[PDB]
Design a protein around this ligand. Structure first.
Ligand SMILES: [Zn+2]
Ligand SMILES: [Zn+2]
Lengths: 88, 50, 361, 178, 111, 46, 49
């Protein structure tokens, strides 16, 4: 998960990465609009330096939604499962 | 545990004893509010064990 | 770039469910529309893997197939995830790429399966004992280690060190002193969390006091968990022995576990001497078990002072006055030789030749 | 800023060819200190009064002399063997002599954290305490395999000249000290 | 059918098992007189272990080789003196000494 | 940057970096929630 | 609830005690896992009952 891509012009995150926290995960309490990313996920393309391409989880919705909780669990396969609870 | 929107709705449903004749309607926009047409009520409650 | 103004401010902005790469300066639509599939269409595309579409799985020998099937069988027996299974098969193929391991012994390839499983288990910080690996692999430890060294020297893959806490937890989960079973009475049953924390503190003390370095870790883990089980209730367990505990827990008693226990108890006695009230009590290797708990409360300063006043094998701490004595350099070479008397005294006489012939007739 | 410690070579291994075929049967029959068993091994074991030395002579003239402490001592032992082979009744010669390997030992006189050493030089080290108590380091500048023990003793092997072992030890000393 | 010929074993805990690495060798130590007669056999034969193992029935050739290596590594002057001294190969008296050593070890076991 | 989280049962503020096994001290529960943001959010009483 | 949150299965380890003959020597095992049976909620072995 990559951090929020801060805009060098205003030293603030862009409108798309505005709701992301320092760790790139959207924090509860804020409102999510249409075409906004919740997890700035980047995955390698090799499977010498790894080449990560971004595949963020954009929110498809006509109306706004508020993040209530963000649960992060770890499975036995070292896989991190992130669940964000949107409310309307 | 109460949702933020439900809490805001309940707070909006609370009446205010302020006299409306001494105030005026807020113009289009101006979310900052002016001293003439706005009232501020702070609510800070921290629950803890006795 | 934009075809009209030539600007490079091309942004992908979806306008009401319409993906469109449009310029941000003049709004010139560069490209629009994307072809996706549809669900019935998705349903009808069948899933085919690269193992079949690329062309592999056909230029494989029956021996390599048996090795892969054994890898998968051992993986499923150990109940490791499919990610571990995939990593294991990948490392097995990578090792088989080499010819030295390709044309090897049956035991060689069996130990190769075992070592690939071990490397896959280590790469994810997962504890798994080479002893159990060999037990489930139908092999001996000598050839196992020999082939492991050979394959690691031939490949050069990352070999993460076996974490001590993970192995401690894995071995503590084995003991049956958590649930009251018919055989084990309730007195021997102890708490799981507290005993595991005590064993972790004890094995950390052992790792910081130079007890696990150079020696097998599992005997030290056994000694630590035994000391914790005795300290959690010293009264009823003052007479219990290491062999008795192993018999009660149904665990194969390690041989050097006794020596590790004796050394750890000596370290604990040193910590007691460092402490004030214990050095006045004048405890011993049998009465310090009740205060082991207190020794771990402030073990930092205690170990610091103990090192102020290095742990090495007993065979080296016997007052090594003459360390590595300098041997007398003797480079006397003469001109080219010495004489022929030594050649004659080395040559076998006819009598000795005939005697040897009569003996070996 | 030298280390102040000098290793000690305990073994010098060198192959040398005699240039003529040999009859191992007669070589073992006409000698007292001869050890040879064709069904077990196809090399005759020769042992002399040099301080320490074992020659593995073969029928093709190739013989490996080991156990010596210096290159000159190994050469003397090889020449002694060759003279013994000549006196046994064979046209043996001393040709193609070159040091193949030399094993040395040294001590640093302070403990070493093998886990820290392997975490710092993993790509150049290997540590498996469940198999061998010694950490196995493989360096290239020294051109040497080193067995390092917790007690502070290091055994180096895989060199060709004493200077290689010396410089390898001088280079590895500050890494172990730090 | 197995008519109660074997007994069930309560071994192999399904939990886990460890390694041994040491299985069979388990040699047996020597004695003073045995070391003396071993040095005698060395002086009488040489370094060929085949004949030494043939003449020693109760000790293994691998153990003999280990002992010879240990002597070469620790006591070199003794090996030098042994190679200096020489004795013609004796068979009947050697068998008599073997019987004497058998009687001596029998007396030891009795003690 | 200190990233803070909350446990599912202990409800204690734990600080962990990236690529760490999700766990909480003095327990073994593997449910970690993220604290609520500190930014100002405006709500409408409608 | 933890299973629902972590997207895993709520099952119990199926174990058995067996006896076999490796080399004509009868060897027995008092506890060996063979599978995992999904446990129904509010069952006899469920933690909710
Ligand atoms: Zn444009
Ligand atoms: Zn917690």
């Amino acid at each position: 998960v990559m951090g929020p891509m801060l805009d060098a012009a205003t030293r603030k995150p862009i409108w798309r990465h505005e709701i992301l926290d320092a760790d790139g995960i959207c924090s509860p309490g804020e409102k999510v609009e249409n075409k906004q990313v919740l997890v700035n996920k980047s995955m390698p393309t090799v499977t010498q330096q790894p080449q990560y391409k971004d595949v963020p989880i954009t929110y498809k919705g006509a109306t706004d939604s508020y993040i209530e909780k963000v649960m992060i669990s770890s499975n036995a396969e070292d896989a991190f499962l992130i669940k964000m609870l949107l409310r309307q | 545990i109460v949702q933020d929107e439900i809490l805001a709705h309940r707070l909006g449903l609370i009446p205010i004893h302020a006299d409306p004749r001494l105030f005026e309607y807020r113009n289009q926009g101006d979310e900052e509010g002016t001293e003439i047409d706005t009232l501020q009520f702070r609510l800070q409650v921290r629950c803890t064990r006795n | 770039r934009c075809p009209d103004c030539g600007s490079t401010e091309l942004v992908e902005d979806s306008h009401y469910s319409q993906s469109q790469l449009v310029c941000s300066d003049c709004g010139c639509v560069v490209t629009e529309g994307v072809l996706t599939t549809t669900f019935s269409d998705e349903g009808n595309l069948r899933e085919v893997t690269y193992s079949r579409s690329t062309g592999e799985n056909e230029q494989v020998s029956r021996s390599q197939q048996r090795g892969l099937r054994r890898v998968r069988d051992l993986c499923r027996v150990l109940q490791l995830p499919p990610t571990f299974e995939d990593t294991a098969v990948a490392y097995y193929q990578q090792a088989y790429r080499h010819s030295g391991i390709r044309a090897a012994r049956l035991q060689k390839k069996e130990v190769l399966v075992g070592c690939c499983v071990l490397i896959t288990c280590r790469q994810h910080n997962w504890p798994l004992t080479m002893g159990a690996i060999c037990t489930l692999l139908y092999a001996d430890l000598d050839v196992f280690s020999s082939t492991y060294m050979q394959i690691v020297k031939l490949l050069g893959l990352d070999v993460p060190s076996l974490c001590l806490a993970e192995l401690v937890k894995t071995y503590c989960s084995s003991f049956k002193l958590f649930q009251a079973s018919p055989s084990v009475p309730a007195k021997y049953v102890e708490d799981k969390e507290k005993m595991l924390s005590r064993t972790m503190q004890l094995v950390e003390l052992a790792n910081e006091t130079w007890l696990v370095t150079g020696r097998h870790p599992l005997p030290v883990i056994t000694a630590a968990t035994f000391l914790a089980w005795q300290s959690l209730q010293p009264a009823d367990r003052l007479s219990c022995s290491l062999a008795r505990f192993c018999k009660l827990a149904n665990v194969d008693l390690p041989y050097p576990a006794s020596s590790r226990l004796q050394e750890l108890l000596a370290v604990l006695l040193r910590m007691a001497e460092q402490l004030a009230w214990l050095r006045v009590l004048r405890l011993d290797k049998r009465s310090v078990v009740k205060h082991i708990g207190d020794l771990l409360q402030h073990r930092q300063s205690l170990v610091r002072s103990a090192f102020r006043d290095l742990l090495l094998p007993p065979c080296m701490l016997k007052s090594p006055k003459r360390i590595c004595p300098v041997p007398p350099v003797s480079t006397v070479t003469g001109d080219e030789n010495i004489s022929d008397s030594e050649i004659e005294q080395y040559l076998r006489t006819p009598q000795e030749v005939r005697d040897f012939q009569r003996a070996q007739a | 800023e030298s280390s102040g410690i000098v290793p000690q070579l305990q073994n010098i291994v060198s192959t040398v060819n005699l240039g003529c075929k040999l009859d191992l049967k007669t070589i073992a029959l006409r000698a007292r200190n001869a050890e040879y068993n064709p069904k077990r091994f196809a090399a005759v074991i020769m042992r002399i009064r040099e301080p320490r030395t074992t020659a593995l002579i073969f029928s093709s003239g190739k013989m490996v002399c080991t156990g010596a402490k210096s290159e000159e001592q190994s050469r003397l032992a090889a020449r002694k063997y060759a003279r013994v082979v000549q006196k046994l009744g064979f046209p043996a010669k001393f040709l193609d002599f070159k040091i193949q390997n030399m094993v040395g030992s040294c001590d640093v006189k302070f403990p070493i954290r093998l886990e820290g050493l392997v975490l710092t030089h993993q790509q150049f080290s290997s540590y498996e305490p469940e198999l061998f108590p010694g950490l196995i380091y493989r360096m290239i500048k020294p051109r040497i395999v080193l067995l390092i023990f917790v007690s502070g003793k290091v055994v180096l092997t895989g060199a060709k000249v004493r200077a290689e072992i010396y410089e390898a030890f001088e280079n590895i000393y500050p890494i172990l000290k730090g | 059918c197995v008519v109660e010929e074997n007994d069930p074993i309560f071994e192999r805990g399904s939990t886990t098992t460890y390694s041994s690495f040491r299985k069979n060798y388990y040699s047996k130590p020597w004695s003073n007189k045995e070391t003396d007669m071993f040095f005698l056999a060395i002086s009488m034969v040489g370094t060929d272990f085949s004949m030494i193992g043939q003449l020693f029935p109760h000790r293994a050739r691998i153990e003999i080789k280990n002992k010879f290596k240990r002597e070469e590594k620790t006591n070199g002057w003794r090996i030098d003196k042994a190679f200096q001294e020489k004795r013609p190969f004796d068979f009947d008296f050697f068998a008599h000494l073997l019987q004497k050593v058998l009687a001596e070890e029998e007396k030891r076991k009795q003690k | 940057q200190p990233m803070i989280y909350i446990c599912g049962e202990c409800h204690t503020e734990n600080e962990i970096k990236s690529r760490d096994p999700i766990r909480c001290r003095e327990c073994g529960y593997r449910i970690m929630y993220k604290k609520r943001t500190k930014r100002l959010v405006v709500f409408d009483a409608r | 609830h933890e299973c629902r949150l972590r997207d895993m299965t709520y099952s119990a380890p199926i174990t058995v005690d067996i006896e076999y003959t490796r080399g004509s020597q009868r060897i027995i095992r008092n506890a060996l896992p063979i599978g995992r049976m999904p446990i129904m909620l509010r069952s006899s072995n469920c933690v909710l009952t």
